[PDB]
Amino acid sequence: HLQTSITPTTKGEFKVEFFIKDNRNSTKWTKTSNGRIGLFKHNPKNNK
Amino acid sequence: DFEEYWDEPNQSKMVKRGPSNNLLGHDQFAGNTLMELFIDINKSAHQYL
């Protein structure tokens, strides 16, 4: 059971943290990876 | 020769807790801790609201 959480942090920004467990039995998750992303439209005029 | 057999998924345990008197509610075991709750103020434990 992998579950991703998305947390609103700032304008555009977001925080991503993951967890795992065993499905039918486990109440215990242990975070495996995390990071931050940002929803900003890029500038495609420096490309190709 | 009695032996004990039983199998209830922990989800059934998390469901049989029913409503919660306090306003914190019951725990949805997931990710960062998550405290859920349903309120119907007509009931006894929330009537004072």
Swiss-Prot record, chain A:
State the superkingdom: Eukaryota
Residue stretches spanning the membrane: none
According to the record, what induces this protein's expression? Up-regulated by P.aeruginosa, PAO1 strain and PA14 strain infection and down-regulated by phagocytic stimuli and growth on bacteria.
Additional facts recorded = Encoded by one of the numerous copies of polyketide synthase genes and clustered as a pair pks16/pks17 in chromosome 2.
The record's function comment reads:
Probable polyketide synthase.
Record's domain comment? Modular protein that is responsible for the completion of one condensation-processing cycle. The beta-ketoacyl synthase region is responsible for the actual condensation reaction while the acyl/malonyl transferase region is responsible for incorporating carboxylic acids units onto an acyl carrier protein (ACP) domain.
Q: What is this protein called?
A: Probable polyketide synthase 16
Q: Which residues of the full protein are shown?
A: 1014 to 1061 of 2603
From Swiss-Prot, chain B:
Please state, per the UniProt record, what induces or represses the expression of this protein: Up-regulated by P.aeruginosa, PAO1 strain and PA14 strain infection and down-regulated by phagocytic stimuli and growth on bacteria.
Q: Which domain of life is it from?
A: Eukaryota
Per the record, the domain comment is: Modular protein that is responsible for the completion of one condensation-processing cycle. The beta-ketoacyl synthase region is responsible for the actual condensation reaction while the acyl/malonyl transferase region is responsible for incorporating carboxylic acids units onto an acyl carrier protein (ACP) domain.
User: What function is annotated for this protein?
Assistant: Probable polyketide synthase.
Additional facts recorded: Encoded by one of the numerous copies of polyketide synthase genes and clustered as a pair pks16/pks17 in chromosome 2.
State the protein's name: Probable polyketide synthase 16
